[PDB]
Amino acid sequence: AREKETKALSLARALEEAMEQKAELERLNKQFRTEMEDLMSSKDDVGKS
Amino acid sequence: LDDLLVDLDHQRQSACNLEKKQKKFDQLLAEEKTISAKYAEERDRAEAE
């Protein structure tokens, strides 16, 4: 039972690390999305034709 | 008939006296089973955990 509890508790650490690691991509994706709109909008202004 | 009654008296008294002390032996076996039952309850609840 302690092994299952330790394995279950240890599994939460992996899930927390995945959420924390995946959280960086979420914030990074949001930052990249804002920069993508700036580069896309600025590109069309230089020569949308 | 008198010899059988007299002989049965010693057997009844011996059987009753022997059975009296045997009750402690049976109780001891039951006590060990009850003590071992505690481990089963701990193991049963342990498996549930």
Swiss-Prot record, chain A:
Localization per record: Cytoplasm, Cytoskeleton; Cytoplasm, Cell cortex; Cytoplasmic vesicle, Secretory vesicle, Cortical granule; Cell membrane
Organs and tissues of expression: In the kidney, expressed in the glomeruli. Also expressed in leukocytes.
Record PTM: ISGylated. Ubiquitination.
S-S bridge residues: none
UniProt disease annotation: Macrothrombocytopenia and granulocyte inclusions with or without nephritis or sensorineural hearing loss: An autosomal dominant disorder characterized by thrombocytopenia, giant platelets and Dohle body-like inclusions in peripheral blood leukocytes with variable ultrastructural appearance. Some affected individuals lack leukocyte inclusion bodies on classic staining of peripheral blood smears. Alport syndrome-like features of nephritis, hearing loss, and eye abnormalities are present in some patients. Deafness, autosomal dominant, 17: A form of deafness characterized by progressive high frequency hearing impairment and cochleosaccular degeneration.
Family of this protein: Belongs to the TRAFAC class myosin-kinesin ATPase superfamily. Myosin family.
Notes on the domains: The rodlike tail sequence is highly repetitive, showing cycles of a 28-residue repeat pattern composed of 4 heptapeptides, characteristic for alpha-helical coiled coils.
Quaternary context: Myosin is a hexameric protein that consists of 2 heavy chain subunits (MHC), 2 alkali light chain subunits (MLC) and 2 regulatory light chain subunits (MLC-2). Interacts with RASIP1. Interacts with DDR1. Interacts with PDLIM2. Interacts with SVIL. Interacts with HTRA3. Interacts with Myo7a. Interacts with CFAP95. Interacts with LIMCH1; independently of the integration of MYH9 into the myosin complex. Interacts with RAB3A. Interacts with ZBED4. Interacts with S100A4; this interaction increases cell motility. (Microbial infection) Interacts with herpes simplex virus 1/HHV-1 envelope glycoprotein B.
Functional description taken from the UniProt entry: Cellular myosin that appears to play a role in cytokinesis, cell shape, and specialized functions such as secretion and capping. Required for cortical actin clearance prior to oocyte exocytosis. Promotes cell motility in conjunction with S100A4. During cell spreading, plays an important role in cytoskeleton reorganization, focal contact formation (in the margins but not the central part of spreading cells), and lamellipodial retraction; this function is mechanically antagonized by MYH10. (Microbial infection) Acts as a receptor for herpes simplex virus 1/HHV-1 envelope glycoprotein B.
Name of the protein this chain belongs to: Myosin-9
UniProt lineage: Eukaryota, Metazoa, Chordata, Craniata, Vertebrata
Full-sequence portion shown in this chain: 1471 to 1519 of 1960
Curated annotation (Swiss-Prot), chain B:
Function: Cellular myosin that appears to play a role in cytokinesis, cell shape, and specialized functions such as secretion and capping. Required for cortical actin clearance prior to oocyte exocytosis. Promotes cell motility in conjunction with S100A4. During cell spreading, plays an important role in cytoskeleton reorganization, focal contact formation (in the margins but not the central part of spreading cells), and lamellipodial retraction; this function is mechanically antagonized by MYH10. (Microbial infection) Acts as a receptor for herpes simplex virus 1/HHV-1 envelope glycoprotein B.
Native organism: Homo sapiens
Superkingdom of the source species: Eukaryota
Modified residues (N6-acetyllysine): K38
Membrane spanning stretches: none
Disease field: Macrothrombocytopenia and granulocyte inclusions with or without nephritis or sensorineural hearing loss: An autosomal dominant disorder characterized by thrombocytopenia, giant platelets and Dohle body-like inclusions in peripheral blood leukocytes with variable ultrastructural appearance. Some affected individuals lack leukocyte inclusion bodies on classic staining of peripheral blood smears. Alport syndrome-like features of nephritis, hearing loss, and eye abnormalities are present in some patients.
Tissue specificity remark: In the kidney, expressed in the glomeruli. Also expressed in leukocytes.
Protein name listed in UniProt: Myosin-9
